[PDB]
Amino acid sequence: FTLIELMIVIAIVGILAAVALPAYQDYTARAQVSEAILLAEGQKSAVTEYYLN
């Protein structure tokens, strides 16, 4: 008898595929969301520039 050793595999086979993937496509999103933010960084002072002058 070994099957419970196979059972535990197929328990490992059914993986979670952690929410630490989709919370980190949401924070990979935070990466390229930031890529949008880093654009905004340029306009921060330029928009400001119009706003002040």
SS3 50: helix
How many residues would you count in the chain? 53
Token pair in block for residue 11: 């328990």
Q: Which residue has the tokens 């928009």?
A: 47
Is residue 6 near its own copies by the rule CB under 8 A? yes
Pick the binder of its own copies from 11, 39, 41, 43 (CB under 8 A): 41
**Least distance in Å: CB of 27 to its own copies?**
6
Largest Cα–Cα distance in the chain? 82
Residues that bind its own copies (CB under 8 A): 3, 6, 9-10, 13, 15, 17, 21-22, 24-25, 27-28, 30-31, 34, 37-38, 40-41, 44, 48, 52-53
